[PDB]
Amino acid sequence: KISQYACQRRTTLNNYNQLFTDALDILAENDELRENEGSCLAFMRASSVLKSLPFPITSMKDTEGIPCLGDKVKSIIEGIIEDGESSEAKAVLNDERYKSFKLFTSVFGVGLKTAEKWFRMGFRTLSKIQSDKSLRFTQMQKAGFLYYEDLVSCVNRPEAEAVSMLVKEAVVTFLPDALVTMTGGFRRGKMTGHDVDFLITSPEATEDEEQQLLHKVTDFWKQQGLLLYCDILESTFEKFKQPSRKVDALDHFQKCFLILKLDHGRVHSEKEGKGWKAIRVDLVMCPYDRRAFALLGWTGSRQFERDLRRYATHERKMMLDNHALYDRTKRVFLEAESEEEIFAHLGLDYIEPWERNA
DNA sequence: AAAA
Ligand SMILES: [Co+2]
Ligand SMILES: [Mg+2]
Ligand code: NA
Numbered sequence: 001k002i003s004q005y006a007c008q009r010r011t012t013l014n015n016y017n018q019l020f021t022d023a024l025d026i027l028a029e030n031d032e033l034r035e036n037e038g039s040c041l042a043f044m045r046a047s048s049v050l051k052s053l054p055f056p057i058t059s060m061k062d063t064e065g066i067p068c069l070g071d072k073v074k075s076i077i078e079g080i081i082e083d084g085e086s087s088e089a090k091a092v093l094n095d096e097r098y099k100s101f102k103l104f105t106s107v108f109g110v111g112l113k114t115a116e117k118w119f120r121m122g123f124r125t126l127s128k129i130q131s132d133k134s135l136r137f138t139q140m141q142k143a144g145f146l147y148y149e150d151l152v153s154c155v156n157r158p159e160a161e162a163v164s165m166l167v168k169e170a171v172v173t174f175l176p177d178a179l180v181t182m183t184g185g186f187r188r189g190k191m192t193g194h195d196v197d198f199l200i201t202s203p204e205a206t207e208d209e210e211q212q213l214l215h216k217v218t219d220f221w222k223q224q225g226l227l228l229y230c231d232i233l234e235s236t237f238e239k240f241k242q243p244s245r246k247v248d249a250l251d252h253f254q255k256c257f258l259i260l261k262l263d264h265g266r267v268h269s270e271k272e273g274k275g276w277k278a279i280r281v282d283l284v285m286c287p288y289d290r291r292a293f294a295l296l297g298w299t300g301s302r303q304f305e306r307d308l309r310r311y312a313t314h315e316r317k318m319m320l321d322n323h324a325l326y327d328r329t330k331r332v333f334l335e336a337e338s339e340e341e342i343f344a345h346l347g348l349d350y351i352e353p354w355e356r357n358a
Numbered sequence: 359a360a361a362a
Contacts, residue, residue, distance in 0.1 A: 111359045140359065184362060197362080231360065250361090257360045282361075300362030322362090356362095 002049065004067040006307035006358030007348060009052040013189055013357055016056040020077055021047045023086035027076070030092040033101045033112070039072075046073040048303045048358045057081070100124055108151055108229075108259070108280065109140030143229040143259055147278035151259075154192035155279055158269035162262055163196045163279055166226070170217045171200055175209065178202040179291070183284075183298035189354035195280035199298055201291045211235065214256050214285055221260065228278055229259035237287070243321035249309060251322045253294060254285045290323050292336040297322030299339075303358040308346075316346055 003009055015021060028043035045068040050057070053066075060078060063069055069077070080086050092098050097119060103126065104115035123129050130145055137145070144151065155163075164182055171178045181187075184197040202210065214232050221227040235254035244250065258281045264272050286294040297305060312320040318334075319326040325334040325345055336342045343350045 109359065114359085138359080188362095233360075248361095255361080284361095298362055302362050305362055 002052065002066055004045075004049075005311045006048050006052075006301075006304045006356075007311050007346075007351065008307075009049070009358065010351060010355040011048070011052045011301075011304070011358045012355055015051050017050040017053055019084065020057060020080055021050050023076060023080060023089035024050070024073070026086075026089040026092050029102075030095070030098050033098060042068075042070060042073065044303060046070070048307075051358060096124070104129070106152055107141060107148065108144030109138055109142075110144060114141075140229070140231070147228060147259055150278035151194075151280055153277075155194065155196055156192055156269070157186065158267050159262060159277065159279060160186050160193065160196045162266040162268070163260065163281055164198070165266065166260065166262075167198050167200075167217075167281070167283065170220055171213065173220065174213055174216045175202045175205055177204050178213070181295060183295065184300060187299050187353045188301065188357050190357075195282055197282045197298060198284065199291070199294055200283060200285045201288050201294070203288045205288075210285055210287065211254065214254060214283060217283070218256060218258070226261045227258065228261055230256060231258075232256040235285075237323060239287075243319040243324045243326050244309075245313075245319065247306065247309075249297075249305075249321040251284070251294075251297065253322070256283050258283065286323075289335070292338050292342055293320075293324055294322050296339045296342055299353050299356060301356055301358050304351075304356040307358065311348070312346055318346065320346075 024043050024047035028040050028047060031040035031043060049066055049068045057063060057077060059081065063074060063077060076086055076088055079088070100119045101115045104110050104118055105112065107126065118129060129135065160182065168180045171180050179201050181199045182196065183199050185193040186196065200213065218227055218230050218232065233255050236252040238252065260279050260281050262277045262279045264275050284294065284298060309320050312318040317328045319328065325336065325342060327334055334345045336345065340350050
């Protein structure tokens with residue numbers, strides 16, 4: 001029996017139901033834009049469960065026993081089986097608001113509010129936005145427009161590895177015992193991504209050393225002429241606070257959102273313009289004792305993380321977030337040195353990172 | 359808005 005929870009399913013990158021899930025993902029994204037959280041969640045859970053199937057749906061009978069497939073979703077599946085297309089997803093792809101919101105938020109520094117603002121001002125193209133003489137842009141948006149073509153092109157694995165080398169070389173310069181781990185999609189086996197994410201932790205660093213590392217590393221890159229954009233968010237981490245009860249938990253660790261200048265020479269690929277590429281990089285610094293919780297949170301996918309936290313609360317009376325695991329019955333925080341220990345605390349079979357593509 |  002297929003579980004309703006992504007944390008009790010193995011979801012690998014061989015999706016046999018891309019025809020259905022691409023349509024469901026479009027409908028979920030449109031519901032996010034239309035602020036319909038409930039309908040968004042229903043399409044996300046249906047898309048997630050189909051992604052886990054070891055075979056393609058080729059008839060309605062194949063959906064028997066699959067959870068998270070309501071009547072609305074089953075009508076969409078039926079329509080795709082009928083002529084290989086989703087009329088519902090096709091209408092979203094041709095909607096002017098949907099097209100504008102996708103296009104505008106593809107700019108680094110542009111979220112839902114700015115995209116809505118520009119749409120209601122009558123803008124439909126990035127060319128008209130960039131060349132407007134009345135619009136005022138944030139420093140994040142200026143970087144987003146300046147490096148747009150590089151940021152919209154997918155980061156591949158040779159580039160992600162080249163970035164890992166740069167991160168490790170910079171980090172060990174100030175903290176030689178630091179452990180740097182690539183997280184996100186690349187850790188789940190993806191060939192491409194919009195960015196490269198890293199978790200940094202040090203077993204011997206002090207509270208002050210931990211705080212100063214991201215400042216030291218970015219100043220070093222600024223001196224090297226590699227820092228194209230930098231925003232450091234200070235830690236709001238609380239050592240003894242209970243984990244988040246929220247559906248989508250906030251991360252309180254010190255982090256930075258960067259744009260790095262990646263020289264082509266540092267990339268060992270099969271394959272060149274200006275000779276460098278702008279790469280979005282995120283760095284997270286966490287206390288050594290919380291490294292397993294942070295790794296599990298930053299590895300994703302977003303759906304796998306939502307279901308882990310939902311399962312912990314509803315099935316185990318536990319509270320899980322990127323910083324800790326709390327047992328409400330035993331009234332104790334549960335320690336973990338690895339992700340495997342977190343899964344064992346939760347009574348779950350271990351799900352490999354490449355199996356968390358929910 | 360930056361976030362898996
Ligand atoms: Co990221
Ligand atoms: Mg990522
Ligand atoms: Na954006």
